[PDB]
């Protein structure tokens, strides 16, 4: 009800009503999809002589030889299920005799708001869309991610900051553990029932419980001839005095446009080290 749902891990309240100010129109091949977040369609499409139905989503095969199919009825239900924000307009026109068309929007956290995109139609005639929008973001920590070297060259790692997912570090194929990392921000929300601590910018998964390997503090800087980003104040180290920390060493490699951080070392379950050759770490022009 009411186009809102609370995040059970962060406590913030997602409110997608600003996305329902107007009809949303999405082209997908020969189709145009119309839907209204938490409201009735105002567009002159998908007429129904059944008054008890309030149409909120419409699939239009454009002319020539066009047609309209009701793809979902009015709902203000927004669900948050194991880390995923979804809205499902149900009750559309009959499909393959035993189904009814539906329209499902998956909302993902984004730096801004991108136009929604049609993904696929499921075998039960559910039309799946993704919508990347800042409205789907729980709170996160963020630091400046641009910097200079001593010679005045400029650098910016901001494009490695990921809002809807996280970087999975590359370990040996035998490693039963895996590492999630983000850049100049805490981790993006994760699907599942075992999420990392909300304050973590780096996290160790595979043990009994996720482990926070450090929080955002300061941005990246050139130190001793290497670009370094450090996360601090993770979970307590086993010695009981220090808190876990993570160092990411970046190096410029123009060919490395879709690289991932590589796990280098974990010392005393306390200091974690990653190395990341990336075209993003090269001097800007
Ligand atoms: C958005 O929301 C909509 C609405 O919920 C989702 O659409 C539904 O998707 C599910 C798939 O996840 C569909 O389930 C399958 O449905 C088929 C067809 O079921 C119909 O025909 C059957 C054959 O005659 C009949 O038995 C069914 O009757 C049962 O279900 C209805 C409710 O739909 C209920 O009223 C009846 O009393 C019965 O309980 C029905 O008329 C079915 O064949 C599938 O069954 C297989 O799998 C299930 C496990 O999933 C298993 O239990 C079965 O034994 C069988 O192995 C399966 O149930 C569903 O039909 C869709 N609903 C409609 C109205 O089309 C949509 O997916 C959502 N989108 C997103 C992205 O979440």
């Amino acid at each position: 009800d009411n186009c809102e749902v609370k995040d059970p891990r962060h406590g913030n309240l997602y409110d997608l009503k600003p996305l329902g100010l107007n009809d949303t129109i999405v082209s997908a091949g020969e189709y145009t999809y119309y839907f209204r977040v938490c409201g009735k369609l105002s567009s002159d499409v998908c007429p129904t002589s059944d008054k008890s139905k309030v149409v909120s989503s419409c699939q239009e095969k454009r002319e020539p030889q066009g047609f309209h199919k009701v793809a979902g009825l009015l709902t203000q239900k927004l669900t948050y299920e194991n880390g995923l924000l979804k809205m499902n307009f149900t009750g559309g026109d009959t499909c393959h005799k035993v189904y009814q068309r539906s329209t499902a929007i998956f909302f993902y956290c984004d730096r801004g708001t991108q136009r929604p995109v049609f993904l696929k139609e499921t075998s039960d005639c559910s039309y799946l869309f993704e919508w990347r929008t800042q409205y789907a973001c729980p709170p996160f920590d963020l630091t400046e991610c641009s910097f200079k070297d001593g010679a005045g060259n400029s650098f910016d790692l901001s494009s490695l900051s990921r809002y809807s997912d996280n970087w999975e570090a590359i370990t040996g194929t035998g490693d039963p553990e895996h590492y999630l990392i983000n850049v100049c921000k805490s981790l993006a929300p994760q699907a599942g029932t075992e999420p990392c601590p909300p304050e973590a910018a780096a996290c160790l998964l595979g043990g009994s419980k996720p482990v926070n390997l450090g929080r955002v503090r300061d941005g990246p800087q050139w130190r001793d001839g290497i670009i370094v980003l450090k996360y601090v104040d993770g979970d307590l180290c086993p010695d009981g005095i220090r808190k876990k920390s993570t160092t990411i060493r970046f190096t410029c490699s123009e060919s490395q446009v879709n690289s991932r951080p590589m796990f280098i070392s974990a010392v005393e379950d306390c200091e974690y080290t990653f190395a990341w050759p990336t075209a993003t770490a090269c001097p800007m022009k």
Side-chain angles (χ1 to χ4, degrees):
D1 165 278
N2 79 15
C3 204
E4 313 158 3
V5 66
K6 294 152 223 114
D7 188 307
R9 307 156 175 177
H10 299 86
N12 64 294
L13 177 112
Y14 300 109
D15 177 5
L16 301 189
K17 282 195 294 299
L19 295 180
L21 241 183
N22 305 284
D23 284 7
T24 302
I25 302 186
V26 179
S27 50
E30 304 290 352
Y31 295 112
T32 299
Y33 292 90
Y34 305 73
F35 48 83
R36 171 82 70 118
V37 175
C38 301
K40 174 191 154 283
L41 274 186
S42 64
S43 298
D44 192 18
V45 296
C46 273
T48 55
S49 64
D50 181 326
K51 41 109 144 139
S52 70
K53 295 184 172 164
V54 178
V55 176
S56 291
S57 182
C58 186
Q59 177 199 59
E60 168 180 54
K61 176 175 184 296
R62 296 182 306 275
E63 297 292 357
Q65 299 84 38
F67 59 72
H68 292 187
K69 303 286 176 183
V70 176
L73 305 185
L74 173 67
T75 183
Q76 300 209 65
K77 177 164 134 184
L78 178 67
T79 57
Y80 174 105
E81 290 172 2
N82 287 344
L84 181 59
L85 264 183
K86 182 173 74 176
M87 177 169 310
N88 188 349
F89 308 88
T90 70
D93 283 337
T94 298
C95 193
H96 312 309
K97 186 172 141 182
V98 303
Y99 303 110
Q100 294 178 309
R101 284 172 182 77
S102 62
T103 299
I105 306 167
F106 304 108
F107 296 96
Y108 299 107
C109 168
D110 193 82
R111 186 182 80 98
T113 285
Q114 318 192 31
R115 296 214 29 88
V117 176
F118 175 75
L119 299 169
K120 64 162 61 144
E121 180 185 347
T122 69
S123 58
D124 53 272
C125 312
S126 200
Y127 305 108
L128 313 188
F129 297 78
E130 66 171 22
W131 200 337
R132 302 183 175 272
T133 170
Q134 187 272 342
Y135 291 110
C137 292
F140 57 92
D141 303 323
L142 178 76
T143 192
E144 175 76 66
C145 209
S146 55
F147 53 104
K148 304 203 181 315
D149 66 12
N153 303 309
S154 298
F155 306 79
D156 193 348
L157 296 178
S158 298
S159 60
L160 303 175
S161 308
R162 294 218 79 95
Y163 283 70
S164 77
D165 46 27
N166 301 291
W167 299 98
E168 175 160 347
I170 295 177
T171 67
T173 54
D175 200 339
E177 298 163 333
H178 63 282
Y179 302 87
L180 299 183
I181 277 174
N182 219 305
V183 176
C184 293
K185 65 184 284 293
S186 48
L187 297 167
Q190 306 111 63
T193 58
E194 205 69 41
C196 292
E199 313 86 349
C203 178
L204 167 61
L205 301 178
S208 36
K209 197 181 41 182
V211 177
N212 177 357
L213 304 178
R215 318 169 181 223
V216 172
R217 186 184 58 181
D218 308 309
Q221 300 287 346
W222 281 93
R223 293 319 156 176
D224 310 302
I226 298 205
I227 298 169
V228 174
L229 179 59
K230 190 171 173 167
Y231 298 140
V232 303
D233 291 328
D235 290 331
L236 260 300
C237 297
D239 65 10
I241 296 136
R242 299 175 289 158
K243 291 185 191 74
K244 289 161 198 282
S245 60
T246 293
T247 299
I248 306 169
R249 293 196 305 259
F250 294 90
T251 63
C252 160
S253 178
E254 288 87 343
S255 65
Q256 292 310 291
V257 295
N258 292 298
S259 53
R260 290 156 57 197
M262 289 180 308
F263 170 74
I264 297 297
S265 76
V267 175
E268 294 159 351
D269 303 310
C270 198
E271 301 186 334
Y272 297 78
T273 301
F274 301 84
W276 197 344
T278 169
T280 313
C282 297
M284 306 189 293
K285 313 320 272 172

